[PDB]
Design a protein around this ligand. Structure first.
Ligand SMILES: C[C@@H]1NC(=O)N[C@@H]1CCCCCC(=O)O
Ligand code: NA
Ligand code: NI
Length: 125
């Protein structure tokens, strides 16, 4: 079965109450911070990612992804999440993602290292 720069930049909110603050660069960079409303997390965490900086103009969304490692000055959950999805522009803009969250585990426990979920981001709370 296998601009965005202007549209992605700013603050987004997911269905869990988490907050994403991101700047999209002209050549595909995403940089910013993330504050999770759930899990072993407090305060903001560094976020970095990439997006398609020259997406198709045929009605398709804009592919992107980013990562947060859940370590900051306050806590370290020994885990990292990566969101993969697309930005869909317009009056009801969305970033629709699926997200993998991997914890450091022993080798014996590796089969239960990684969650899969889905987060939908909107520009209004
Ligand atoms: C991926 C989910 N979407 C989200 O906004 N936060 C969740 C992840 C929280 C993980 C916090 C660190 C931990 O508990 O391991
Ligand atoms: Na694993
Ligand atoms: Ni956790």
């Amino acid at each position: 079965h296998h601009t965005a720069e202007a549209g992605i930049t700013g603050t987004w909110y997911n269905q869990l109450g988490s907050t994403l603050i991101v700047t999209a660069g002209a050549d595909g960079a995403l940089t910013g911070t993330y504050e999770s409303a759930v899990g072993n997390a407090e305060g903001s965490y560094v976020l970095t990612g990439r997006y398609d900086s020259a997406p198709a103009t045929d009605g398709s969304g804009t592919a992107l992804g980013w990562t947060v490692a859940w370590k900051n000055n306050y806590r370290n959950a020994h885990s990292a999440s990566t969101w993969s999805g697309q930005y869909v522009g317009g009056a009801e803009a969305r970033i629709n993602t699926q997200v993998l969250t991997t914890s450091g585990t022993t080798e014996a426990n590796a089969w239960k290292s990684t969650l899969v979920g889905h987060d939908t981001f909107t520009k209004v709370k």
